[PDB]
Tab-separated table of C-alpha atoms in Angstrom:
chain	number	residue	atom	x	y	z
A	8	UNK	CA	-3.458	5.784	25.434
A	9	UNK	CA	-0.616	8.184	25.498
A	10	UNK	CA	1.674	5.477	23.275
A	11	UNK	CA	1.075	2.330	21.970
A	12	UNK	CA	3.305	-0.360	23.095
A	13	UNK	CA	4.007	-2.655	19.986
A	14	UNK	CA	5.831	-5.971	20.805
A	15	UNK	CA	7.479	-8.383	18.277
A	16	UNK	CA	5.143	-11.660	17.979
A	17	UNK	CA	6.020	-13.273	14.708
A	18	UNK	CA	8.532	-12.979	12.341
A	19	UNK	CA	8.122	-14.721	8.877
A	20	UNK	CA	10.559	-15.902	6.919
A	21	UNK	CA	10.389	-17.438	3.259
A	22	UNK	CA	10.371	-14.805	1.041
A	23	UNK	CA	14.064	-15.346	-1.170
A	24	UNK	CA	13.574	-11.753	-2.398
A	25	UNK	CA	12.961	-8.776	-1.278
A	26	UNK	CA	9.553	-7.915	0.351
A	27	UNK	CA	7.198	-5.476	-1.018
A	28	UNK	CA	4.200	-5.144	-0.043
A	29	UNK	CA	2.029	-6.540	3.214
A	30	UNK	CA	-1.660	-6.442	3.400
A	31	UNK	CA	-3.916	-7.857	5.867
A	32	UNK	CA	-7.237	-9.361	4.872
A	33	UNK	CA	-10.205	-7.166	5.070
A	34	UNK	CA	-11.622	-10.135	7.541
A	35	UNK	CA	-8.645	-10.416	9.890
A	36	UNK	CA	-8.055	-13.970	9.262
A	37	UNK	CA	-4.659	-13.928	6.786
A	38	UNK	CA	-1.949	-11.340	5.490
A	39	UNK	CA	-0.701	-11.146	2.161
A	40	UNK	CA	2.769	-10.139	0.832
A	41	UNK	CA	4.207	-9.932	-2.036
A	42	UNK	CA	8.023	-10.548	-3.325
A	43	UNK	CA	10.912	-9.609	-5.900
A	44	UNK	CA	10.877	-13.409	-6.194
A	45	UNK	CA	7.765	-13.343	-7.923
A	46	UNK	CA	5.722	-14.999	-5.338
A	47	UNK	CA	2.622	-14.299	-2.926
A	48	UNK	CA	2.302	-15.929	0.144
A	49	UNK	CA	-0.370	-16.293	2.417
A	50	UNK	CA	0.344	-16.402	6.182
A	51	UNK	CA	-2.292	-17.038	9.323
A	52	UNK	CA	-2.768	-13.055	11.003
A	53	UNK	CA	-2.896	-13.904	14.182
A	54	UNK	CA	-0.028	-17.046	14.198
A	55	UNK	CA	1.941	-16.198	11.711
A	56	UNK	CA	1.949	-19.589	10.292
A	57	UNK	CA	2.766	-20.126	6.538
A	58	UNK	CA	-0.575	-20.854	4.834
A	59	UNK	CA	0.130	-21.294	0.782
A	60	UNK	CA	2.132	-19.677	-1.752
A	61	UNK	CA	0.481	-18.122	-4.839
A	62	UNK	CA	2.701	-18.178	-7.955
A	63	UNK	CA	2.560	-17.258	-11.858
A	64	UNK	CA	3.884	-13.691	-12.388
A	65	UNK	CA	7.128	-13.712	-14.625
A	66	UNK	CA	8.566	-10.875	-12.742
A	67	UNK	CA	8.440	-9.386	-9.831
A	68	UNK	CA	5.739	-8.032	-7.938
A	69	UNK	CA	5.378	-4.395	-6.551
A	70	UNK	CA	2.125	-4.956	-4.845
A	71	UNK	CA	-1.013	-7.065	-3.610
A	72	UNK	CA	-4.467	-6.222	-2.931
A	73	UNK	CA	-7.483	-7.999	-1.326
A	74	UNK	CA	-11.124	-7.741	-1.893
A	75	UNK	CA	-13.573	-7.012	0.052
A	76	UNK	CA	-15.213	-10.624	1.036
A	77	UNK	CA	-11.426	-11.509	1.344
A	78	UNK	CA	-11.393	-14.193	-1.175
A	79	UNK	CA	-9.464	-12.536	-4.406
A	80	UNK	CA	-6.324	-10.958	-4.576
A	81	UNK	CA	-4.926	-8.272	-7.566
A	82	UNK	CA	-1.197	-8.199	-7.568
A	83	UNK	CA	0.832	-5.657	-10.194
A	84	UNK	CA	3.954	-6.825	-11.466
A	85	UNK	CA	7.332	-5.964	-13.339
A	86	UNK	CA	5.995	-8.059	-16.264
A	87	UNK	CA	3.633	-5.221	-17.062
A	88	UNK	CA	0.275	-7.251	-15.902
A	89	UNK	CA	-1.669	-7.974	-12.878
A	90	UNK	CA	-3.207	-11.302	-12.304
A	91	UNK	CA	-6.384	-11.423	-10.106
A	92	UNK	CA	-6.452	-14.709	-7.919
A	93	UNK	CA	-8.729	-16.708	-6.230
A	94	UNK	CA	-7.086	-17.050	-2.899
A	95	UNK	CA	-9.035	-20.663	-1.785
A	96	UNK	CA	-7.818	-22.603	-5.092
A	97	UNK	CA	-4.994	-20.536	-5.934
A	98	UNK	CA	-6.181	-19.980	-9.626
A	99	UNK	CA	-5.260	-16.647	-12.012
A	100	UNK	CA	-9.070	-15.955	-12.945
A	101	UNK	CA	-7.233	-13.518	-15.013
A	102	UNK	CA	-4.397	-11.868	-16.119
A	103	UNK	CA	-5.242	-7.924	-16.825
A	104	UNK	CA	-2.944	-6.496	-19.985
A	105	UNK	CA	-2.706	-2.827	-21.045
A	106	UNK	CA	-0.322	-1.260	-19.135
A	107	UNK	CA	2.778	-0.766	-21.365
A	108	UNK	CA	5.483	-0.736	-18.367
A	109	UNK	CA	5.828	-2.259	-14.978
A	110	UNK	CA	2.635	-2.231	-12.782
A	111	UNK	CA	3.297	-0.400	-9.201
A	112	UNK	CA	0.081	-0.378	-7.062
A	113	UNK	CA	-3.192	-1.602	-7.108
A	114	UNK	CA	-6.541	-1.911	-5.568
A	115	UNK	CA	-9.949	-2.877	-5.194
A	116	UNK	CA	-12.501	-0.516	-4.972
A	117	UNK	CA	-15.120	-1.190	-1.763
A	118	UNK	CA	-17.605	-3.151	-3.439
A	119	UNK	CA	-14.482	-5.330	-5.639
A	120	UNK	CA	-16.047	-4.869	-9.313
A	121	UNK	CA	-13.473	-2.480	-10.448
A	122	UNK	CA	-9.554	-2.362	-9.750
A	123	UNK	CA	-7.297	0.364	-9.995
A	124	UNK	CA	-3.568	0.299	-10.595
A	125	UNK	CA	-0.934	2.355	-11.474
A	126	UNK	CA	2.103	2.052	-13.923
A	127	UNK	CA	5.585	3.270	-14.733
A	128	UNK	CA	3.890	4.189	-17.884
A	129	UNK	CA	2.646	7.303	-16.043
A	130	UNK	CA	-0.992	5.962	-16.305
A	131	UNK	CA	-3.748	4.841	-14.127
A	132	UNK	CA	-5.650	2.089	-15.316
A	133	UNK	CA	-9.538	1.109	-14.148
A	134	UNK	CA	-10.382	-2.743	-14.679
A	135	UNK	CA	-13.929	-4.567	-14.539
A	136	UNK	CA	-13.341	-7.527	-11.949
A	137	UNK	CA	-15.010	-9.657	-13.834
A	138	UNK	CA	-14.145	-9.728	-17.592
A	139	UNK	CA	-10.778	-8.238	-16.730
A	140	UNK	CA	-10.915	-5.385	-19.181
A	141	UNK	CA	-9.674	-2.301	-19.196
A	142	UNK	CA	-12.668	0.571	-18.716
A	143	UNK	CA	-10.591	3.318	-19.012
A	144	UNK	CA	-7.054	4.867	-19.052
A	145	UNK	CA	-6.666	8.232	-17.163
A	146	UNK	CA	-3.251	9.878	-18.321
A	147	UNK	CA	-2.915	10.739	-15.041
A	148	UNK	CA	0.951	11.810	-14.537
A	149	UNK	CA	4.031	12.685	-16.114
A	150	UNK	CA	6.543	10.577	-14.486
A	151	UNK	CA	5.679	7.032	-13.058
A	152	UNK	CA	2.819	6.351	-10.739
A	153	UNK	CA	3.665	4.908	-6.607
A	154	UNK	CA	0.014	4.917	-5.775
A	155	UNK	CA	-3.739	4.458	-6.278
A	156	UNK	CA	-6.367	3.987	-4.089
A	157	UNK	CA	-10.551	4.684	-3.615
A	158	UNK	CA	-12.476	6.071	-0.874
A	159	UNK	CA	-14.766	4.686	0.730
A	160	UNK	CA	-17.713	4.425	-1.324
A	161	UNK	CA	-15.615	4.207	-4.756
A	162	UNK	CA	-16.784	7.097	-6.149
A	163	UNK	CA	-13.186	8.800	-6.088
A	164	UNK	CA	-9.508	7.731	-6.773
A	165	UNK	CA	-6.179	9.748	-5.523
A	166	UNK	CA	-3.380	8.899	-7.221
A	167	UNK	CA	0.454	10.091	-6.926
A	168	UNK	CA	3.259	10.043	-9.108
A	169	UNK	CA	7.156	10.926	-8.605
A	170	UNK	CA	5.968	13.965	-10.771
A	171	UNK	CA	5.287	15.419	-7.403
A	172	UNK	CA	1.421	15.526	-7.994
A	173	UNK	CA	-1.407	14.047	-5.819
A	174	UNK	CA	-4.695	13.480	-8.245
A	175	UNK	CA	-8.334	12.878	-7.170
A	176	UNK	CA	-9.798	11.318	-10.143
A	177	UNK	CA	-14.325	10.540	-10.799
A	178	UNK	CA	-13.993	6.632	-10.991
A	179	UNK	CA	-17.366	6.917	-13.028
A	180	UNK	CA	-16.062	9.505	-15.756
A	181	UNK	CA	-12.171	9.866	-15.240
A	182	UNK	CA	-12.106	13.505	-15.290
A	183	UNK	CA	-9.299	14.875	-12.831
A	184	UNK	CA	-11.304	16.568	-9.874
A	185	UNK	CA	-8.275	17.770	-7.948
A	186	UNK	CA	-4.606	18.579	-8.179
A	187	UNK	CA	-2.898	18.573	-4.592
A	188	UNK	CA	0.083	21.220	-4.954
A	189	UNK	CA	2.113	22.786	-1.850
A	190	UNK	CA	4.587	24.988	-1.203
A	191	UNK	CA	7.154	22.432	-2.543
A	192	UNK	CA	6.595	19.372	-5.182
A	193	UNK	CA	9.055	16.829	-4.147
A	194	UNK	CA	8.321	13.276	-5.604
A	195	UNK	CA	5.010	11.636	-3.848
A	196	UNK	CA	5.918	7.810	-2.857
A	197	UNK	CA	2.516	7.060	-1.737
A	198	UNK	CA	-1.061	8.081	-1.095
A	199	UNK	CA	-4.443	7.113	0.317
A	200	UNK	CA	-7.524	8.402	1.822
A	201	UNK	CA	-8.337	8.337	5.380
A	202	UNK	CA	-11.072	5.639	6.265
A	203	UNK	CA	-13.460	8.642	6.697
A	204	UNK	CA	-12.360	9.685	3.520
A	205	UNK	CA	-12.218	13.402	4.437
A	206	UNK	CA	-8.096	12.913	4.783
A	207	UNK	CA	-5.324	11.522	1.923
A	208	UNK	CA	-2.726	10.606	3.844
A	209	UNK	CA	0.786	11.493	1.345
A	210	UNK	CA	4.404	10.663	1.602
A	211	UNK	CA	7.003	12.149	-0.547
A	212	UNK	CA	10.867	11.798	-1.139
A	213	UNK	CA	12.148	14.588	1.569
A	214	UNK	CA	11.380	12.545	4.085
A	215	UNK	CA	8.135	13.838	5.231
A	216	UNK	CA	4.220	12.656	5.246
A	217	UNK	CA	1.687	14.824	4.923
A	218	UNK	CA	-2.198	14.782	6.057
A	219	UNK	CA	-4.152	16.961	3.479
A	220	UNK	CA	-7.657	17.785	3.988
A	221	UNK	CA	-9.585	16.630	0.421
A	222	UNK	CA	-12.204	19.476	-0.332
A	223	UNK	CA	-10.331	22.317	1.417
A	224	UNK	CA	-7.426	21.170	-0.303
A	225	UNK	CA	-5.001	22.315	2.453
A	226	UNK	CA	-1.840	20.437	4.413
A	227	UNK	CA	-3.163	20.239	7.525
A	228	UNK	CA	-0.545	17.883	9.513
A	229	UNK	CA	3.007	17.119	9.085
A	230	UNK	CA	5.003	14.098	10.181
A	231	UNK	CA	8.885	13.640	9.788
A	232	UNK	CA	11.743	11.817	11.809
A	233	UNK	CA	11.715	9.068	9.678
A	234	UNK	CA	14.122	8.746	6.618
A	235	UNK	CA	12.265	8.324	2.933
A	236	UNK	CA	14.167	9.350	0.038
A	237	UNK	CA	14.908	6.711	-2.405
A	238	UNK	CA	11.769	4.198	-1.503
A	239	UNK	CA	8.048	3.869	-2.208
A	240	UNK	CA	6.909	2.929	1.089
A	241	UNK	CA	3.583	2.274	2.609
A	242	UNK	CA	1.832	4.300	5.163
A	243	UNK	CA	-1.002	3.567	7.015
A	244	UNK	CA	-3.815	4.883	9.472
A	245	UNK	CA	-4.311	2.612	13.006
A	246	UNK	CA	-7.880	2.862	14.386
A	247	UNK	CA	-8.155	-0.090	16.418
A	248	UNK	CA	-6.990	1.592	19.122
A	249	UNK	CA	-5.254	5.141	19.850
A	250	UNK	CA	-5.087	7.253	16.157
A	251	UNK	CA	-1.914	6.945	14.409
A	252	UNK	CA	0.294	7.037	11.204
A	253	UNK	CA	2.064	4.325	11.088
A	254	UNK	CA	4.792	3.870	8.436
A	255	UNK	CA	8.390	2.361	7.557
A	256	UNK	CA	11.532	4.330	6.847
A	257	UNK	CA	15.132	3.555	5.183
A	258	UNK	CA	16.465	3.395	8.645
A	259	UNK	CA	15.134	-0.130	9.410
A	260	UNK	CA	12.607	0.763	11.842
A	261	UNK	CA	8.276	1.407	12.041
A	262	UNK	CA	7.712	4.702	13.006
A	263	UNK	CA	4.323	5.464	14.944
A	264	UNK	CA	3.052	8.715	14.759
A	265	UNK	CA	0.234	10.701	17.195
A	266	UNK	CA	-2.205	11.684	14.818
A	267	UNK	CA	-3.344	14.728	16.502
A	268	UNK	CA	0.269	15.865	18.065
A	269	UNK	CA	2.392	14.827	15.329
A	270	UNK	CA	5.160	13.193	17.938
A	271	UNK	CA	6.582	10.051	17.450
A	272	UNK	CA	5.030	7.901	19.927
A	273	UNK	CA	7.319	4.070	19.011
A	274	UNK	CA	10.144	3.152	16.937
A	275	UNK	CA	9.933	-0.513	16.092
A	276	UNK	CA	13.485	-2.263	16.236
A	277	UNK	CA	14.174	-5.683	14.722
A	278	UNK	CA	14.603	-5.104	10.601
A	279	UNK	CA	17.815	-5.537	9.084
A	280	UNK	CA	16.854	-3.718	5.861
A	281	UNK	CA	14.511	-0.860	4.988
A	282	UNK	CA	10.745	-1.559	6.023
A	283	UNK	CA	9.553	-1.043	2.465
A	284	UNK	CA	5.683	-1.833	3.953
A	285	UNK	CA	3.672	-1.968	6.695
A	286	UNK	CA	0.080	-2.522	7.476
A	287	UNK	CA	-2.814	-2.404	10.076
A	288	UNK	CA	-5.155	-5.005	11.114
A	289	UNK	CA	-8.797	-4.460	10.611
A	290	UNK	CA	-10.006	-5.579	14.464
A	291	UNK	CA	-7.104	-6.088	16.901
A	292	UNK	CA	-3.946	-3.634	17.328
A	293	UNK	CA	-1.482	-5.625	15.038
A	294	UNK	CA	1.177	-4.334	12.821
A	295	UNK	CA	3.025	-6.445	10.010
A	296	UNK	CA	5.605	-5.108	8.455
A	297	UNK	CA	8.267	-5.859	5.616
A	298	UNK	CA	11.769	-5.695	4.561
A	299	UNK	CA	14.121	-5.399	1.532
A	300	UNK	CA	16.976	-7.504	-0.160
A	301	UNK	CA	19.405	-7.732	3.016
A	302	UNK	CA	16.449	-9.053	5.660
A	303	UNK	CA	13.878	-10.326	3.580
A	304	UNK	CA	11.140	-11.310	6.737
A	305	UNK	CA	7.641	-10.051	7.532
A	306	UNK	CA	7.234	-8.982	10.935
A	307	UNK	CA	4.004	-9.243	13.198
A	308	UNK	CA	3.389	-6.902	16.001
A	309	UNK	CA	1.379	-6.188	18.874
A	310	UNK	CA	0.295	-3.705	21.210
A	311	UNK	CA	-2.279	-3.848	24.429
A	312	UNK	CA	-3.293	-0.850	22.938
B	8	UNK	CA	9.985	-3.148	-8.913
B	9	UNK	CA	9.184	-1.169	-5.785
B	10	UNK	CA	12.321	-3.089	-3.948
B	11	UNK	CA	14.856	-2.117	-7.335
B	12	UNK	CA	17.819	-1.140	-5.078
C-alpha cells in the first residue's frame, strides 16, 4: 500500500560474535546467518526457532549463500576459503582454495553449478559446484571486492569493489562487459541485480544507494537518509508485496525505501548495533535482519503488507 | 571480516 507496516516477531540470539550476513532460503522454510565467531546457524523462517549450527571455518565468516533447491550453502571466510555445505548432514563437501586473502561475498548462480565470490585480493573467483575448482580468475578490481552476484539466468556477474567501480562480467568467458562510472566514484559496499535483472541495485560509502539501469548504463534512482560510511552492508529488493529497497544503516535501524518515490516509507527500531544485513523472504512479507559486535541478534519482521 | 570494527 502506501507503507508497509513491519512489526518485530522474533529476535534470535546465539551468535557470540558479530553478525554478518542473513539469507533466507530460496524455499522459505529456514534463514541462514553467518558470524565473526566462525559459525553458521540455521534458524526456522517463520518461528524463529534455532535449527542447527554449521561449523569448520578457522576464521570468521563475511558471508553465506544458498542454492537454489535450498539444500547447500557457500560461505567465504577470513581464512581465505569458502566451504560449500550440505545443509541436511552438516558436511563440508568441500573447501574451495585460491583466493590469496580473506573471502567477502559469495553466491550461487540460478541453476547452483558455479559459485562466485569475491576477495580482499581484489579478485573475483568462478568455482564448479561440484569438483570445487577454480574455472577462472577475473582481475576484476583494484582495491578489495564487497560484492558479487548473477542475474537471473547466470549468464552475467556485477561485481563492486571499494575501488569505486561496479563491473558486469560474461560468466561464460570473463571478459568485463561493463564499467558503471558516475559523476562521483566513492567506494561501492555492495551490489546486485534486480530480480528482473534490468536493475543493479548499488550502495556506496557516502551514504547513498543507487538504482542503475544495466544496458543504458544510467543512475536512474537515488536513495539516502540512511548512514553508510564505514560498513559493507546488504541491500535488498521486497516484491512480496508493495516495491521497496530495503537496507540497514550505521544508525541501528532498517530503512524501507518506495521504489518508485524514493521516500522513506519505515524505520525499523530495536538494534543496538549497526544492521550490517538484512534480507527478504521469497513468499510472505518478512524481513530478518542483523547486527554487529555490541547487539549481536537476528531480527525477524513482519508486515500485513 | 565484513564486521572488522
Amino acid at each position: 500500500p502506501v507503507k508497509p507496516n513491519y512489526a518485530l516477531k522474533f529476535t534470535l540470539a546465539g551468535h557470540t560474535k558479530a553478525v554478518s550476513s542473513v539469507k533466507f532460503s530460496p524455499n522459505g522454510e529456514w534463514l541462514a546467518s553467518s558470524s565473526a565467531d566462525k559459525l553458521i546457524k540455521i534458524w526456522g523462517a517463520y518461528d524463529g526457532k534455532f535449527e542447527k549450527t554449521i561449523s569448520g571455518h578457522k576464521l570468521g565468516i563475511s558471508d553465506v549463500a544458498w542454492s537454489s533447491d535450498s539444500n547447500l550453502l557457500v560461505s567465504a571466510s577470513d581464512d581465505k576459503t569458502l566451504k560449500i555445505w550440505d545443509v541436511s548432514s552438516g558436511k563440508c563437501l568441500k573447501t574451495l582454495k585460491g583466493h590469496s586473502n580473506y573471502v567477502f561475498c559469495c553466491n550461487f548462480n540460478p541453476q547452483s553449478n558455479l559459485i562466485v565470490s569475491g576477495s580482499f585480493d581484489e579478485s573475483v573467483r568462478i568455482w564448479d559446484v561440484k569438483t570445487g575448482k577454480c574455472l577462472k580468475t577475473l582481475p576484476a578490481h583494484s582495491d578489495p571486492v564487497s560484492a558479487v552476484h548473477f542475474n537471473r539466468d547466470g549468464s552475467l556477474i556485477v561485481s563492486s569493489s571499494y575501488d569505486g567501480l561496479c563491473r558486469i562480467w560474461d560468466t561464460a568467458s570473463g571478459q568485463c562487459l561493463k564499467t558503471l562510472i558516475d559523476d562521483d566514484n566513492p567506494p561501492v559496499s555492495f551490489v546486485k541485480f534486480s530480480p528482473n535483472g534490468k536493475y543493479i541495485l548499488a550502495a556506496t560509502l557516502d551514504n547513498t544507494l543507487k538504482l542503475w539501469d544495466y544496458s543504458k548504463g544510467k543512475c536512474l534512482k537515488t536513495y539516502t537518509g540512511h548512514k553508510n560510511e564505514k560498513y559493507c552492508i546488504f541491500a535488498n529488493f521486497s516484491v512480496t508485496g508493495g516495491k521497496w529497497i530495503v537496507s540497514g544503516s550505521e544508525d541501528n535501524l532498517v530503512y524501507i525505501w518506495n521504489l518508485q518515490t524514493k521516500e522513506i516509507v519505515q524505520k525499523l527500531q530495536g538494534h543496538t548495533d549497526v544492521v550490517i544485513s538484512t534480507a527478504c523472504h521469497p513468499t510472505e512479507n518478512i524481513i530478518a535482519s542483523a547486527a554487529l559486535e555490541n547487539d549481536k541478534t537476528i531480527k525477524l519482521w513482519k508486515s500485513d503488507c | 571480516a565484513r564486521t572488522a570494527r
